[PDB]
C-alpha cells in the first residue's frame, strides 16, 4: 500500500540514517523495553540494561533487516521470508508487539532526524513499518 511518494520518503529518510542504523535499532529496542515492559518477556536470556552488547547486537540485526526491506521495498515478502518463518514458527512473538517496536523506531528516528522527519515522511515511515510488520506476521497461522 506504499505509494511512489511513500517509497521515495522512506528511501530518503533511511539513507540519512545510513551507517547509524545499528545504533538507532539498539536505541529503539531500549525505548521499547522501558516504555512497554511486557515486550521484555521475549528476551529473558538477554541482559537488558542500558549499554548491553546483547541489545546492541540485536539492534544491529533488526536495523540491517529494515535496510534490506527498504532495498527490497517492492518485494518485501520474499526478501523477509526467512524472518517471517522465524518469527511465526520459532520465536512466536505475539503480533501486537510489532506495533510497539514500530512506534519506538519512529520515536528514535524523530529524535535523530530533526530536518527529515516532516509530517509526510512520518506518515510514510509509519505505513512502511506497518507493512514490514504485516509481512513478518503473515505466516503465523
Amino acid at each position: 500500500v506504499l505509494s511512489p511518494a511513500d517509497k521515495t520518503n522512506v528511501k530518503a529518510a533511511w539513507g540519512k540514517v545510513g551507517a547509524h542504523a545499528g545504533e538507532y535499532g539498539a536505541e529503539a529496542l531500549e525505548r521499547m523495553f522501558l516504555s512497554f515492559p511486557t515486550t521484555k518477556t521475549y528476551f529473558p536470556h538477554f541482559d537488558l540494561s542500558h549499554g548491553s552488547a546483547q541489545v546492541k547486537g540485536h539492534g544491529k540485526k533488526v536495523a540491517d533487516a529494515l535496510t534490506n526491506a527498504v532495498a527490497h521495498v517492492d518485494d518485501m515478502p520474499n526478501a523477509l521470508s526467512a524472518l517471517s518463518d522465524l518469527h511465526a514458527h520459532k520465536l512466536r512473538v505475539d503480533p501486537v508487539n510489532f506495533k510497539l517496536l514500530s512506534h519506538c523506531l519512529l520515536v528514535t528516528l524523530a529524535a535523530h532526524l530533526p530536518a527529515e522527519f516532516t509530517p509526510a515522511v512520518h506518515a510514510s515511515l509509519d505505513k512502511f513499518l506497518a507493512s514490514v510488520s504485516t509481512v513478518l506476521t503473515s505466516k503465523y497461522r
Binding site: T38, T41, L91, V93
Partner: protein, 146 residues
Amino acid sequence: VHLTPEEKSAVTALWGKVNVDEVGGEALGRLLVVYPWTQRFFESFGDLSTPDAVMGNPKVKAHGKKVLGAFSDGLAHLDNLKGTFATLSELHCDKLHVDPENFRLLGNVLVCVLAHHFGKEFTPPVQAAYQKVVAGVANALAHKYH
C-alpha cells in the same frame, strides 16, 4: 470488576453449569489451535501438530483444568481480582515470561467456548458481563508485570 448485581448473578448462575475440567481443556486447546503462536510455552507437552492432537493431548487438558480452576476460584472474588491474582501475575512475568496479550486471547476464546456450550442461553447481556470479567482477569494477571 464493577459488575452490577444482576451482572454478577448472571455470571455466577451460568458458571454453576460449567464442567470446569471440560471447558478448561476445550478453551486451552482452542487457544493453541486458533492462535498457534501460544504453543511456544508448551513444547514439553508433546504432540501439538494437528487440531485433533492438541485437543486430545492429556497435558493440554491438564493445564486447561489448572488454568480454569484458578479462574473459577477468582469468580468468588470479583471485588478483589488484583489481590487474588497478584502472586500469579508475578509468577507469569518473572518466571514464566508469558506476554499478557495471551491472557486477552484466552479470554476471548473462553467467551467463544461458553457461547458454543450454552447456545441461546449465552445472551448478549450475559456475554457483556463475561467480557467485563475476562478483561478484569487479564488486567489483574498483567498488573505486576515490570
